[PDB]
Amino acid sequence: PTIPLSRLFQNAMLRAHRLHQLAFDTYEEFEEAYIQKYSFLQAPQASLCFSESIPTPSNREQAQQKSNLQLLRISLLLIQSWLEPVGFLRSVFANSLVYGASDSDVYDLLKDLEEGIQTLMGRLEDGSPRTGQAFKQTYAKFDANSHNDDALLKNYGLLYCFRKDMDKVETFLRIVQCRSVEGSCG
């Protein structure tokens, strides 16, 4: 009955591109309405995002062979980290000039994806484990709030990184769904 397991990979996949899209909708307009990024903004605002993991597998290549179970553990930190904002922190940070209220404003697309992406490790746990983080560790990027004339380049960053630390929760979960089931991607 709603058991086909492939639908798990589905649910997360529909919502995770549904999720690259708002982070990059919001990214796109935001930079124009404020910043001339390479005027000299790049080196003095020196990286972060989850660019440091197995630094992005994405050009088309299926992430190089690795364990079906770390792209899901090495993923869930990338989502659970934004989840430290998306709990009380409102739109005054990421208020959607481009919106639809599609689904469930921004938390519960982010929240359902980590809830549903929980049910797939509990299902792969033992034969190939030793999953590199073990004991409690929080991952909270920074936090964001409000308008000034620097504050927003504090801000910019997360609205840029939710591009660059999302090309991985979905494309890199896309690998596990076009690596761990048959068809329907290619």
From Swiss-Prot:
<dbReference type="InterPro" id="IPR001400">
    <property type="entry name" value="Somatotropin/Prolactin"/>
</dbReference>
<feature type="binding site">
    <location>
        <position position="170"/>
    </location>
    <ligand>
        <name>Zn(2+)</name>
    </ligand>
</feature>
<dbReference type="GO" id="GO:0048513">
    <property type="term" value="P:animal organ development"/>
</dbReference>
<dbReference type="GO" id="GO:0040018">
    <property type="term" value="P:positive regulation of multicellular organism growth"/>
</dbReference>
<keyword id="KW-0732">Signal</keyword>
<feature type="disulfide bond">
    <location>
        <begin position="178"/>
        <end position="185"/>
    </location>
</feature>
<dbReference type="GO" id="GO:0010828">
    <property type="term" value="P:positive regulation of D-glucose transmembrane transport"/>
</dbReference>
<feature type="modified residue" description="Phosphoserine">
    <location>
        <position position="102"/>
    </location>
</feature>
<dbReference type="GO" id="GO:0007259">
    <property type="term" value="P:cell surface receptor signaling pathway via JAK-STAT"/>
</dbReference>
<feature type="modified residue" description="Phosphoserine">
    <location>
        <position position="146"/>
    </location>
</feature>
<keyword id="KW-0582">Pharmaceutical</keyword>
<dbReference type="GO" id="GO:0070195">
    <property type="term" value="C:growth hormone receptor complex"/>
</dbReference>
<dbReference type="GO" id="GO:0046872">
    <property type="term" value="F:metal ion binding"/>
</dbReference>
<dbReference type="InterPro" id="IPR018116">
    <property type="entry name" value="Somatotropin_CS"/>
</dbReference>
<keyword id="KW-0597">Phosphoprotein</keyword>
<protein>
    <recommendedName>
        <fullName>Somatotropin</fullName>
    </recommendedName>
</protein>
<keyword id="KW-0479">Metal-binding</keyword>
<dbReference type="GO" id="GO:0005576">
    <property type="term" value="C:extracellular region"/>
</dbReference>
<dbReference type="GO" id="GO:0060396">
    <property type="term" value="P:growth hormone receptor signaling pathway"/>
</dbReference>
<feature type="binding site">
    <location>
        <position position="17"/>
    </location>
    <ligand>
        <name>Zn(2+)</name>
    </ligand>
</feature>
<dbReference type="InterPro" id="IPR009079">
    <property type="entry name" value="4_helix_cytokine-like_core"/>
</dbReference>
<keyword id="KW-1015">Disulfide bond</keyword>
<dbReference type="GO" id="GO:0070186">
    <property type="term" value="F:growth hormone activity"/>
</dbReference>
<comment type="subunit">
    <text>Monomer, dimer, trimer, tetramer and pentamer, disulfide-linked or non-covalently associated, in homomeric and heteromeric combinations. Can also form a complex either with GHBP or with the alpha2-macroglobulin complex.</text>
</comment>
<dbReference type="GO" id="GO:0008083">
    <property type="term" value="F:growth factor activity"/>
</dbReference>
<dbReference type="GO" id="GO:0005125">
    <property type="term" value="F:cytokine activity"/>
</dbReference>
<dbReference type="GO" id="GO:0005615">
    <property type="term" value="C:extracellular space"/>
</dbReference>
<dbReference type="GO" id="GO:0051897">
    <property type="term" value="P:positive regulation of phosphatidylinositol 3-kinase/protein kinase B signal transduction"/>
</dbReference>
<dbReference type="Pfam" id="PF00103">
    <property type="entry name" value="Hormone_1"/>
</dbReference>
<dbReference type="GO" id="GO:0005179">
    <property type="term" value="F:hormone activity"/>
</dbReference>
<dbReference type="GO" id="GO:0043568">
    <property type="term" value="P:positive regulation of insulin-like growth factor receptor signaling pathway"/>
</dbReference>
<dbReference type="GO" id="GO:0097696">
    <property type="term" value="P:cell surface receptor signaling pathway via STAT"/>
</dbReference>
<dbReference type="GO" id="GO:0070977">
    <property type="term" value="P:bone maturation"/>
</dbReference>
<dbReference type="GO" id="GO:0060397">
    <property type="term" value="P:growth hormone receptor signaling pathway via JAK-STAT"/>
</dbReference>
<comment type="function">
    <text>Plays an important role in growth control. Its major role in stimulating body growth is to stimulate the liver and other tissues to secrete IGF1. It stimulates both the differentiation and proliferation of myoblasts. It also stimulates amino acid uptake and protein synthesis in muscle and other tissues.</text>
</comment>
<feature type="modified residue" description="Deamidated glutamine; by deterioration">
    <location>
        <position position="133"/>
    </location>
</feature>
<dbReference type="GO" id="GO:0019221">
    <property type="term" value="P:cytokine-mediated signaling pathway"/>
</dbReference>
<dbReference type="GO" id="GO:0031667">
    <property type="term" value="P:response to nutrient levels"/>
</dbReference>
<dbReference type="GO" id="GO:0005131">
    <property type="term" value="F:growth hormone receptor binding"/>
</dbReference>
<keyword id="KW-0242">Dwarfism</keyword>
<keyword id="KW-0862">Zinc</keyword>
<dbReference type="GO" id="GO:0043406">
    <property type="term" value="P:positive regulation of MAP kinase activity"/>
</dbReference>
